[PDB]
Amino acid sequence: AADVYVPDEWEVAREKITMSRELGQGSFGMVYEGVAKGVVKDEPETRVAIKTVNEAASMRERIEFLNEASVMKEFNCHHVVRLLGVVSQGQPTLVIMELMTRGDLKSYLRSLRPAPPSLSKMIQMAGEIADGMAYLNANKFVHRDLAARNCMVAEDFTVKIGDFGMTRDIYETDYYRKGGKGLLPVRWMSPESLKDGVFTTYSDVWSFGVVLWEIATLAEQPYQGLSNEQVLRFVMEGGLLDKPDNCPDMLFELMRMCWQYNPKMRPSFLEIISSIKEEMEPGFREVSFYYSEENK
Numbered sequence: 168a169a170d171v172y173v174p175d176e177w178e179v180a181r182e183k184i185t186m187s188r189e190l191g192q193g194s195f196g197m198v199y200e201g202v203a204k205g206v207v208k209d210e211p212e213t214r215v216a217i218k219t220v221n222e223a224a225s226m227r228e229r230i231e232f233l234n235e236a237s238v239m240k241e242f243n244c245h246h247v248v249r250l251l252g253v254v255s256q257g258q259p260t261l262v263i264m265e266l267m268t269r270g271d272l273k274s275y276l277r278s279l280r281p282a283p284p285s286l287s288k289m290i291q292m293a294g295e296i297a298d299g300m301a302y303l304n305a306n307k308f309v310h311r312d313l314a315a316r317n318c319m320v321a322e323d324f325t326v327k328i329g330d331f332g333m334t335r336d337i338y339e340t341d342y343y344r345k346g347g348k349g350l351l352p353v354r355w356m357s358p359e360s361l362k363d364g365v366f367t368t369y370s371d372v373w374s375f376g377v378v379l380w381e382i383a384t385l386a387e388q389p390y391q392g393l394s395n396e397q398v399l400r401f402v403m404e405g406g407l408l409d410k411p412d413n414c415p416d417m418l419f420e421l422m423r424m425c426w427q428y429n430p431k432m433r434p435s436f437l438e439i440i441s442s443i444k445e446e447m448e449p450g451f452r453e454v455s456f457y458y459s460e461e462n463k
């Protein structure tokens with residue numbers, strides 16, 4: 168008997184992947200743009216993103232890397248970035264993913280600053296993100312680091328849920344580190360996450376509210392002008408982000424619902440999609456988790 172990563176149908180021969188450029192570093196190591204052969208059915212070649220570890224010599228980072236990639240093997244949603252494969256045998260350890268050609272949502276939103284995104288465009292982004300999150304929550308996954316920087320933009324401008332590795336510790340389920348060296352995205356965090364480190368579908372809804380505010384401000388810094396320590400206290404004392412200039416009333420109203428102090432008073436992602444579904448593009452019905460037979 169053994170409890171090591173076991174190569175499966177997701178394993179890809181090393182010789183079938185080439186890297187061509189740097190895309191940037193989120194969790195773990197550099198992400199590269201490249202090409203993988205035989206990863207998509209009836210495509211000989213596929214443009215892909217290829218993720219590495221940060222520290223070559225760390226077996227623990229290696230195992231954690233692969234455990235986190237294995238989580239994605241379960242996901243099949245138009246609004247979540249897809250896993251395409253894994254190179255686990257020998258070094259370097261590689262994770263092969265759907266290439267999101269327009270980069271991260273935060274960088275995208277910043278690029279639109281000098282007309283600004285129309286309400287309809289904003290709603291469309293919101294519903295796509297909420298749909299991805301509804302799928303994940305329905306599959307018992309709590310993202311914990313939802314933020315524009317961890318949503319990704321497709322060639323066709325579809326927003327999809329991305330990097331969830333930044334705040335996952337290797338030992339967390341069995342062991343606690345006293346005090347805590349853990350990374351905490353405080354400006355995106357619910358009062359109960361700030362208080363006790365509790366992360367649920369409800370705290371993901373809180374972060375979603377902050378992503379809406381990022382969309383409406385074109386990725387201004389939430390609580391700009393407060394330190395990290397000041398944000399933590401401010402939000403735990405019931406502080407809220409202000410309504411952005413020229414924010415459509417309906418969007419701010421959504422933020423307000425997501426930012427109920429008590430987690431049980433917050434909408435679910437399904438309830439958010441429900442409230443905005445009529446303002447989504449017609450194609451949303453055909454690609455969404457919300458309208459799929461999985462949504463039961």
Ligand SMILES: Nc1ncnc2c1c(-c1cccc(OCc3ccccc3)c1)cn2[C@H]1C[C@@H](CN2CCC2)C1
Nearest residue numbers: 191192193198216235248264265266267271329330332
């Ligand atoms: N698919 C992609 N396509 C194109 N670029 C991508 C991605 C992903 C990408 C997308 C989805 C998931 C993901 O982590 C999953 C995971 C988690 C844990 C272990 C193994 C894998 C990475 C990140 N980037 C870029 C690298 C840049 C990071 N920046 C933006 C802020 C810092 C953005």
